[PDB]
Design an enzyme around this catalytic site. Structure first.
Site, PDB file in Angstrom:
ATOM      1  N   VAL A  15       0.873  -1.211  -0.056  1.00  0.00           N
ATOM      2  CA  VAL A  15       0.069   0.051  -0.082  1.00  0.00           C
ATOM      3  C   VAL A  15       0.818   1.365   0.141  1.00  0.00           C
ATOM      4  CG1 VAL A  15      -2.046  -0.988   0.804  1.00  0.00           C
ATOM      5  CG2 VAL A  15      -0.165  -0.562   2.515  1.00  0.00           C
ATOM      6  N   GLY A  16       2.042   1.103   0.135  1.00  0.00           N
ATOM      7  CA  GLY A  16       3.053   2.387   0.322  1.00  0.00           C
ATOM      8  C   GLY A  16       4.512   1.817   0.906  1.00  0.00           C
ATOM      9  N   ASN A  17       5.423   2.857   0.682  1.00  0.00           N
ATOM     10  CA  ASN A  17       6.918   3.017   1.478  1.00  0.00           C
ATOM     11  C   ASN A  17       7.295   4.240   1.387  1.00  0.00           C
ATOM     12  OD1 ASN A  17       6.932   2.012  -1.783  1.00  0.00           O
ATOM     13  ND2 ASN A  17       8.229   3.571  -1.576  1.00  0.00           N
ATOM     14  N   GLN A  22       8.531  -1.261   3.636  1.00  0.00           N
ATOM     15  CA  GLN A  22       7.219  -0.928   2.865  1.00  0.00           C
ATOM     16  C   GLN A  22       6.156  -1.547   3.855  1.00  0.00           C
ATOM     17  OE1 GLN A  22      10.027  -3.478   1.055  1.00  0.00           O
ATOM     18  NE2 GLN A  22       9.294  -1.781   0.003  1.00  0.00           N
ATOM     19  N   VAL A  23       5.035  -1.061   3.472  1.00  0.00           N
ATOM     20  CA  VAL A  23       3.860  -1.165   4.393  1.00  0.00           C
ATOM     21  C   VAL A  23       2.714  -1.962   3.348  1.00  0.00           C
ATOM     22  CG1 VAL A  23       1.757  -0.264   5.399  1.00  0.00           C
ATOM     23  CG2 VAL A  23       3.600   1.012   5.373  1.00  0.00           C
ATOM     24  N   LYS A  38       3.664  -3.277   8.632  1.00  0.00           N
ATOM     25  CA  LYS A  38       4.930  -2.560   8.185  1.00  0.00           C
ATOM     26  C   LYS A  38       6.036  -3.516   8.339  1.00  0.00           C
ATOM     27  CE  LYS A  38       5.734   1.883   8.590  1.00  0.00           C
ATOM     28  NZ  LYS A  38       4.768   2.617   9.146  1.00  0.00           N
ATOM     29  N   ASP A 137       6.009  12.892  14.944  1.00  0.00           N
ATOM     30  CA  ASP A 137       5.983  12.621  13.414  1.00  0.00           C
ATOM     31  C   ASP A 137       4.849  13.094  12.552  1.00  0.00           C
ATOM     32  OD1 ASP A 137       7.519  11.854  11.323  1.00  0.00           O
ATOM     33  OD2 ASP A 137       7.257   9.833  11.417  1.00  0.00           O
TER      34      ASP A 137
HETATM   35  N1  LIG Z   1      -2.429   1.455   9.263  1.00  0.00           N
HETATM   36  C1  LIG Z   1      -2.447   2.088   7.830  1.00  0.00           C
HETATM   37  N2  LIG Z   1      -3.392   1.756   6.998  1.00  0.00           N
HETATM   38  C2  LIG Z   1      -3.391   2.002   5.681  1.00  0.00           C
HETATM   39  N3  LIG Z   1      -2.385   2.460   5.457  1.00  0.00           N
HETATM   40  C3  LIG Z   1      -1.195   2.783   5.862  1.00  0.00           C
HETATM   41  C4  LIG Z   1      -1.153   2.369   7.206  1.00  0.00           C
HETATM   42  N4  LIG Z   1       0.058   2.893   7.606  1.00  0.00           N
HETATM   43  C5  LIG Z   1       0.729   3.285   6.979  1.00  0.00           C
HETATM   44  N5  LIG Z   1       0.083   3.367   5.683  1.00  0.00           N
HETATM   45  C6  LIG Z   1       0.650   4.104   4.298  1.00  0.00           C
HETATM   46  O1  LIG Z   1       1.687   3.333   3.769  1.00  0.00           O
HETATM   47  C7  LIG Z   1       2.318   4.310   3.154  1.00  0.00           C
HETATM   48  C8  LIG Z   1       3.747   4.284   3.604  1.00  0.00           C
HETATM   49  O2  LIG Z   1       3.883   4.565   5.234  1.00  0.00           O
HETATM   50  P1  LIG Z   1       5.067   4.785   5.861  1.00  0.00           P
HETATM   51  O3  LIG Z   1       6.239   3.595   5.577  1.00  0.00           O
HETATM   52  O4  LIG Z   1       4.964   4.805   7.305  1.00  0.00           O
HETATM   53  O5  LIG Z   1       6.069   6.059   5.617  1.00  0.00           O
HETATM   54  P2  LIG Z   1       5.668   7.654   6.000  1.00  0.00           P
HETATM   55  O6  LIG Z   1       4.634   7.799   6.728  1.00  0.00           O
HETATM   56  O7  LIG Z   1       5.503   8.319   4.609  1.00  0.00           O
HETATM   57  N6  LIG Z   1       7.088   8.282   6.862  1.00  0.00           N
HETATM   58  P3  LIG Z   1       7.177   7.571   8.443  1.00  0.00           P
HETATM   59  O8  LIG Z   1       5.883   7.327   9.237  1.00  0.00           O
HETATM   60  O9  LIG Z   1       7.912   8.735   9.320  1.00  0.00           O
HETATM   61  O10 LIG Z   1       8.252   6.555   8.238  1.00  0.00           O
HETATM   62  C9  LIG Z   1       1.992   5.609   3.569  1.00  0.00           C
HETATM   63  O11 LIG Z   1       1.278   6.123   2.532  1.00  0.00           O
HETATM   64  C10 LIG Z   1       1.105   5.463   4.881  1.00  0.00           C
HETATM   65  O12 LIG Z   1       0.068   6.423   4.754  1.00  0.00           O
HETATM   66 MG   LIG Z   2       2.023   6.074   7.535  1.00  0.00          MG
HETATM   67 MG   LIG Z   3       3.872   6.935   8.591  1.00  0.00          MG
END
Ligand SMILES: Nc1ncnc2c1ncn2[C@@H]1O[C@H](COP(=O)(O)OP(=O)(O)NP(=O)(O)O)[C@@H](O)[C@H]1O
Ligand SMILES: [Mg+2]
Ligand SMILES: [Mg+2]
Ligand SMILES: [Mg+2]
Lengths: 295, 299
Positions: A15-17, A22-23, A38, A137
């Site tokens: 869903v993202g990184n 990554q997540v 994560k 954060d």
């Molecule tokens: N619980 C969740 N549910 C849905 N999406 C999520 C969740 N947690 C994180 N994401 C999404 O996954 C993507 C990667 O997030 P992330 O690895 O946490 O990096 P970041 O928030 O941009 N920086 P950081 O939190 O400081 O490490 C982001 O677009 C998040 O919004």
């Molecule tokens: Mg996030």
């Molecule tokens: Mg985050």
């Protein structure tokens, strides 16, 4: 005593990184219930620190404005490779407010959507502060929505505590645009530390991001933004179309010197946050917008 | 192999398995369809609008040839996703299967390499950097993680397109400040450095932090929060090795790389003539010891 996730949780899709690892969208194997997971490389020496972090994350996430933390796992890897830490929390289906504003025509949210989201943020922050926790954060990527237009904070600061080598996962500085001035060390500010009011500055920046589609200094190199924030006056909304109330709330969040920055309880009593008439319809507008964009 | 274009990778390169996590997207094992040649591929989501920026940056690419101490950069590709959906940028690079120098030092007793090993690896780093520098290119990310080994004990620099720095600019990665520990003072903006210049000598500072990382398994200030270290790097005097076992040549080499003011830092060529780097009697044995260590590790 942290277990392998096999048969308990499994990965579905990214869903993202960013930052590190990554997540994934993830699934609790036995019930099919979704979760966000994560995933990030760690060394085995990090394990003691991880158990402290996860414990803290679970304890403070039981509020309706914080994504609830379920658990942490370690998926061991063959010799030579690093093991993977899996950090498991509530899945927020609608994604981040950074995504929202991105997928919205004009890269701008209606004022009353901004008032609703910012109040939800403040309530989440309120919960953490009263428990003596600084989020540290706050930013658009760390503010999430559910399918039902609910707003939840994710990724509040745990660690570092432990007088150890800091693990890779914690060695990256991150995007600086949402950071308060007092958090950035300089000559006059050598030990530069977090204060609960550091989050309120970040909420103000997040509000501008909702209004304009990007934080202040977005056209500048991140390192140069780091240099400018402690020197610049408080950022301002660029357009004058916004209400006097919105301007005043931004001014409140963005008080340069944190010593005279309002507390979280004060901002919650600010007319922009406190007085919200169209709440119900905002929710619906939000609900409907989410659906449109998924499709 | 084309380094000015930006085609779909379909029927050209294909992904076969995730190999690890680089900065910051995923690195796959990939193979060129028509030759079957292995490659490392770094994959990244990018928005439609980012793709015009990417084009500009490819124009800014500088050209340089193959070199035995640089993992060859093969070029870039955009894999198209259905409209609306974000595409993927693919950065293709020569595959090296024996891990990084960081893996190497972390898998020892006491997290430390013999001084003649450090001298050997450091020279290979310096040679690759010389080639880059002579073609007007800065590497920008010298560190143990970015120094790789082959099954033959060849030392090579990670190169996913260092001339353009795409793996650090696309998909919002440009908004990130990464890890500060290997950064030269001049890349860190501080009260005395309003505009953080990158210079080719910036790599030489980083090569110095990397030799310390080989000697102690970690860079200086590894115990600090990265924000605290970011502040400290421009203010502390040049870092140094903790232990005193090390030779005077090695101390001198570290001192030679770690000059605070980059204007007063030596160039790559000058540093290649440093006796620590220039005089390696046990060279061949070292390369043997290295080849051997690698093999026993695969087992
Ligand atoms: N619980 C969740 N549910 C849905 N999406 C999520 C969740 N947690 C994180 N994401 C999404 O996954 C993507 C990667 O997030 P992330 O690895 O946490 O990096 P970041 O928030 O941009 N920086 P950081 O939190 O400081 O490490 C982001 O677009 C998040 O919004
Ligand atoms: Mg996030
Ligand atoms: Mg985050
Ligand atoms: Mg909760």
């Amino acid at each position: 005593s942290l277990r392998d996730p096999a048969g308990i949780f499994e990965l579905v899709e990214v869903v993202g990184n960013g930052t590190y690892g990554q997540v994934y969208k993830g699934r609790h194997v036995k019930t099919g219930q979704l979760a966000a997971i994560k995933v990030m490389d760690v060394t085995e020496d990090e394990e003691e620190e991880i158990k402290l972090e996860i414990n803290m994350l679970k304890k403070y996430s039981h509020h309706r404005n914080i994504a609830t933390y379920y658990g942490a796992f370690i998926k061991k890897s063959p010799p030579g490779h690093d093991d993977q830490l899996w950090l498991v929390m509530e899945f927020c289906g609608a994604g981040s407010i950074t995504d929202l504003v991105k997928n919205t025509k004009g890269n701008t949210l209606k004022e009353d959507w901004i008032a609703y989201i910012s109040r939800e943020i403040l309530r989440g922050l309120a919960h953490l502060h009263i428990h003596h926790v600084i989020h540290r954060d706050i930013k658009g990527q760390n503010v999430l929505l559910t399918e039902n237009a609910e707003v939840k904070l994710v990724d509040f600061g745990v660690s570092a505590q432990l007088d150890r080598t800091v693990g890779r996962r914690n060695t990256f500085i991150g995007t600086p645009y949402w950071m308060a001035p007092e958090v950035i060390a300089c000559d006059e500010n050598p030990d530069a530390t977090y204060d609960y009011r550091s989050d309120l500055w970040s909420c103000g920046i997040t509000a501008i991001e909702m209004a304009e589609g990007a934080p202040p200094l977005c056209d500048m190199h991140p390192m140069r933004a780091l240099f400018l924030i402690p020197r610049n006056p408080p950022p301002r909304l660029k357009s004058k179309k916004w209400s006097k109330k919105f301007f005043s709330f931004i001014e409140g969040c963005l008080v340069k010197n944190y010593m005279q920055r309002p507390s979280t309880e004060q901002l919650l009593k600010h007319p922009f946050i406190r007085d919200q008439p169209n709440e119900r319809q905002v929710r619906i507008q939000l609900k409907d917008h989410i659906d449109r964009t998924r499709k």
